[PDB]
Structure 1
Amino acid sequence: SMEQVAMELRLTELTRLLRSVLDQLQDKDPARIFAQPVSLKEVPDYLDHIKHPMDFATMRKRLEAQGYKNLHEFEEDFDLIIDNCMKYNARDTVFYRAAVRLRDQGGVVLRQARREVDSIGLE
C-alpha cells in the first residue's frame, strides 16, 4: 500500500538521522573504549555482572537493519553502553571516566536530536 511505503520512508529517514547521531556520539569516544563488545575472552565473567551488553558496533548493526523504530529505542542502547561501564568499572578507572565524559557530551547531541525527530515527525 501507499501508506506502508510512506511509513518505510519515514523509518529510512529516521535511520538517516540516527546514523548521523551515532557518528557524533562516537566522536565523543576518541579512545574507542566503547567501539566494540567487551571481550568475553579478556573478561570471562562479564555476563555474570552485565545482563545486557552493548557497544557502538552492535548499535550500528541494529541501525542498518532499521531496527530502531524511534529515538527512545536508540537512546536505550546508548544508555546501556554508559550504565554497563559505570557499574562494572570503579569510579577511579579510565573506563568509568570515559563513560562519564561520553554521557555528558552526548546529552547535547541527543537533546537536539529529539527536537529534530519531533519537528520533522520521524516517528
Structure 2
Amino acid sequence: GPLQLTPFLILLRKTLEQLQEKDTGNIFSEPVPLSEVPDYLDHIKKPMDFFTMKQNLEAYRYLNFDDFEEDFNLIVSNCLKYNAKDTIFYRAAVRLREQGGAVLRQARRQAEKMGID
C-alpha cells in the first residue's frame, strides 16, 4: 500500500503499536460489529478502535498529537459508557486507560521536542 514517511507519522506508528500492546485481549483491535450489537449507536455517537486509528494515521488524517490522543480516549470512553462496570470489557478499558496514559505522556514529549505536537 501507499506509505508516507515523515517524523510525525513515524512517531504516531510507534505510539500506536505501544498502545495496542497494552490491549492484551485484542478487545479494541476492530470496530464493534453493529450487526451483532444492534443497540451500540443508540449510546455511542462516534465508535473508535485501533484498526480505524491505523487507517486514519496512514491516510494523514491525524495532523497533530491532540487529535490522535482524542481518538484513543474515545476507544476508552465509549467502552466505559456502553458496557456495565462488572463486564470484562469495562475492566479492560480501565486497564487500557491507565497503561495508555503513560504511553501518551512519553510520546507527546517527543512530539513537542521535535517540532511536531
Identical-pair percentage: 63
**Which TM-score applies when normalising by structure 1?**
0.89
Contact in 2 for aligned 1:50/1:88 (Cα 8 Å): yes
Task: String of CA shifts for 1:44-85, please: whole Å, max 9, x gaps.
Answer: 111111010000000000000111100000001000000000
Distance (Å, rounded) in 1 between the aligned partners of 2:29 and 2:65: 20
**In the alignment, structure 1 residue 93 sits paired with structure 2 residue 61:** no
User: Of the candidates 37, 41, 51, which is equivalent to residue 47 of structure 1?
Assistant: 41
Which structure 2 segments of 5+ residues have no match?
Answer: none
Task: Report the counterpart of residue 24 of structure 1 in structure 2.
Answer: 18
Which contiguous aligned blocks of 4+ residues in structure 1 show a shift greater than 2 angstroms? Answer: none
The structure with the largest alpha-carbon Rg is: 1
Superposition CA RMSD, Å: 1.3
Pairs aligned (count):
114
**What is aligned with 1:33?**
27
Residue in 2 that maps onto 1:114: 108
Give the CA deviation at 1:13.
Answer: 1.3
Residues in 2 aligned to 1:40 and 1:67: alpha-carbon distance in whole angstroms: 24
